[PDB]
């Protein structure tokens, strides 16, 4: 009944919750990453072509 | 330090002068930009011969 789901769904949330902070993660440093390369290919543009 | 004889990345169009300011956890970059903001159009000859 009640007692047994509420410790597996919790488990299962908590679990849940704490990947998705670790995709968000990827998702910053690929932004980041993304934003470096962004400002370099600008200076390409505005230089060598 | 040098005005021009490098590719305008650090000022905004043609670029004359900066000016450096301290900032709070860092350096504030002001830049001094021409902007032309004016289009006329005139025949143009590529060199002359005599």
């Known amino acids: ?49 | 330090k040098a005005q021009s004889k490098r590719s305008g990345f650090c000022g905004q169009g043609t670029h004359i002068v900066s000016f450096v300011v301290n900032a709070p956890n860092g350096l504030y970059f002001m830049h001094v930009g021409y902007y032309p903001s004016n289009h006329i159009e005139v025949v143009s000859a590529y060199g002359l011969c005599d």
């Open chain 1, 1 to 49: 009944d009640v007692l047994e789901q509420d410790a597996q769904i919790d488990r299962l949330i908590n679990g849940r919750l704490t990947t998705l902070n670790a995709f968000v993660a990827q998702q910053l440093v690929r932004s980041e990453s993304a934003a470096l390369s962004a400002q370099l290919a600008k200076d390409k543009v505005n230089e060598c072509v």
